[PDB]
Write a protein that binds this ligand. Structure first.
Ligand SMILES: Cc1ncc(COP(=O)(O)O)c(CN[C@@H]2CONC2=O)c1O
Ligand SMILES: Cc1ncc(COP(=O)(O)O)c(CN[C@@H]2CONC2=O)c1O
Ligand SMILES: [Cl-]
Lengths: 382, 383
């Protein structure tokens, strides 16, 4: 029934509301709900169905496998994936009508052959490296790749449906690289559009860019994190101020509550020692479940009406908390992260406690943790 | 057929070799292979099967669900799980002949009711908190818990098959807490025995205690990490020094290789800027796959014959490495973590880079990452 140890509660109603709120932010563009990495830990399919429901025109994933799983789940509509390696399932992707990203000639050649075998045309989108220095084609190789693409288009083997890029510091309001990439993108797009490419969509914005720079919207925006009700960065504001609602609530039940004398060590390395006779509670969730070990001694948890802090080192499967004078009992609910509007710890709180970013917190929630859905439509729960 | 992006290759022969090596260390005790957390990221069923056939007489998991997955996979023999919460599948565990741990009064009473409903006697193991401050019964409550158990015993509802504990700093050779806990264990164990408990097994030793303090072996030793070929700590030496063979090898295929101008920013935040014109390579694995973001700028990877450091911020699905003048092409192999003997970066190397411990490195390798099994017996990698 309802997991007795720990479980991740996913609110499909918060998801749908976030996508409606995000659509309103970029009224002139289409919305792509990025659901890679199991929808940032919330559950790929359920969240993809909910997103499409609230009005998402596109669905995006990193790997082909992720995109094929969406199709296999009966999801219709445009889907795009961009992280490819030589020898990937191009043919499978083409046959399921999935837009593929091309960054180098090696990719283009593999998609052209796969198209032949499939006896079908592949919808490809050209990625320009405007400054991030990650994936994508560099300005120096752009003219060549562009020429090869319009050539393959003529051979009826491919069809260039898009031209896109990705930001490096869009989450740093005001960073000089942002404008630099926006200009580099405008310039490389024009050169492509002048060489014979008529794109279906033009896109470069992610969640932070979408929430702050309307000049980056173009035809489509790729929103991942914001969809799950988490703010890209604190400099952009809290989900509340952003009009977003947190989709995930992580809950656990106490496994033990006992009294210990003063001077008693707690956990590995005994990095925590009780100050006086106190009450300790055992939370049965550890770093194997996604609770960062680097949050040792700082991780916030809500127990018995008050916020508690991880006591000492966080272990593989569990960690303790010092309830002090307060009392509680085994089976009592413990909220590790959820909604700030309900006075609970948040994804951002843990990011700060573990010296990382909110993106990693929600995304790394372990497979050992069951997910429970509420809201949305019944079929979303599959 | 074989993962084109990233994958974990698990060497089942290394597993068999380690448990065999571990048994030679504690000749007069039974060995419990701890395969919780999906065998520390190596694959629970294949590893449980392998260790069993190599000589492990007991199997240990943290949760009931993990222990029941083993039974469901046809694994026979003694199995124990210790992380229970109210409402757990007591009835189901008891019926599948799994040894459960009881550290409080709430548990004891739930298992009694469960045993009655199953029409069978439950095998329970009493845990004593000798200094960890985690689970287990505090010394001052031992008397009462031991009292309620020997009673439930007389009613034929339960049978106390074991008494045990867990060390806080056995991985720190010569720590005063070690002896402190060992002493406490003997003392609490003795009391239990005197009041009526006849344990089938007495245990307190984990991997580090097993490799260092033979006086902690007792009847059973619970080894987890060492079974997979990784050392509990640099302080104890390297796997090679401990005579252990690493079982996991994380490999990836470059997704791109390109030349970039001098002074070009790399990844989020631009925390890395090329010092000159150079070749950049994209490794298609990121923190969603288990590569810690905390190793940004430090995590080692073996590419084109040399060890390279993560250039800048590590992302959710990938990260970049600067190859300098060297050349490589999309599809070429990169070893993220493997065997130092093969000249590859290791679990410890990454533990250092991410300011954490090797335990968390191997364990958090994601589900998005496929596992390929080599060696062992064919039927082992069927699940
Ligand atoms: C190419 C691309 N587009 C869009 C997104 C969506 O971004 P948001 O989640 O910010 O809306 C991502 C995710 N980028 C991530 C997130 O964390 N690490 C990454 O590489 C991406 O890689
Ligand atoms: C109760 C218990 N027994 C045995 C083991 C196996 O120990 P080794 O892996 O050191 O051999 C562990 C380790 N559990 C882990 C591992 O890391 N943190 C923990 O709490 C444990 O918690
Ligand atoms: Cl109790």
């Amino acid at each position: 029934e309802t997991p007795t140890r720990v479980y991740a509660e996913i609110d499909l109603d918060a998801v749908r509301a976030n996508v409606r709120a995000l659509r309103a932010r970029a009224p002139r563009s289409a919305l792509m709900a990025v659901v890679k990495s199991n929808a940032y830990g919330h559950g790929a399919v359920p969240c993809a169905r909910a997103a499409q429901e609230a009005g998402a025109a596109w669905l995006g994933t990193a790997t082909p496998e992720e995109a094929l799983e969406l199709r296999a789940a009966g999801i219709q509509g445009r889907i795009m994936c961009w992280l490819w390696t030589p020898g990937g399932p191009w043919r499978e992707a083409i046959e399921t009508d999935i837009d593929v990203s091309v960054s180098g000639m090696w990719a283009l050649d593999e998609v052209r052959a796969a198209a032949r075998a499939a006896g079908r045309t592949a919808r490809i989108q050209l990625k320009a490296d405007t400054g991030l220095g990650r994936n994508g084609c560099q300005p120096a190789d752009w003219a060549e790749l562009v020429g090869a693409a319009v050539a393959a288009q003529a051979e009826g083997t491919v069809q260039v449906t898009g031209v896109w890029s990705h930001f490096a510091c869009a989450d740093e309001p005001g960073h000089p690289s942002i404008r630099l990439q926006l200009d580099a993108f405008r310039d490389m797009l024009a050169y492509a559009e002048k060489e014979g490419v008529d794109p279906e969509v033009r896109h470069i914005a992610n969640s932070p860019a979408t929430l702050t720079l309307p000049e980056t919207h173009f035809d489509l925006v790729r929103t991942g994190l914001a969809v799950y009700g988490v703010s890209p960065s604190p400099e952009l504001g809290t989900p509340a101020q952003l009009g977003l609602r947190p989709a995930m609530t992580l809950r656990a039940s106490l496994a033990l509550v006992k009294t210990v004398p003063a001077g008693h060590g707690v956990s590995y390395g005994h990095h925590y020692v009780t100050e006086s006779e106190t009450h300790l509670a055992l939370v049965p969730a550890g770093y194997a479940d996604g609770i960062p070990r680097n949050a040792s001694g700082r991780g916030p948890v809500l127990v018995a009406g008050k916020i508690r802090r991880a006591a000492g080192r966080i272990a593989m499967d569990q960690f303790v908390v010092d309830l002090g004078e307060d009392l509680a009992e085994a089976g009592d609910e413990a909220v590790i992260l959820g909604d700030a509007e309900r006075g609970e710890p948040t994804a951002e709180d843990w990011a700060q406690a573990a010296h990382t970013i909110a993106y990693e917190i929600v995304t790394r929630i372990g497979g050992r943790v069951p997910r429970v859905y509420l809201g949305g439509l019944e079929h979303h729960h599959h």
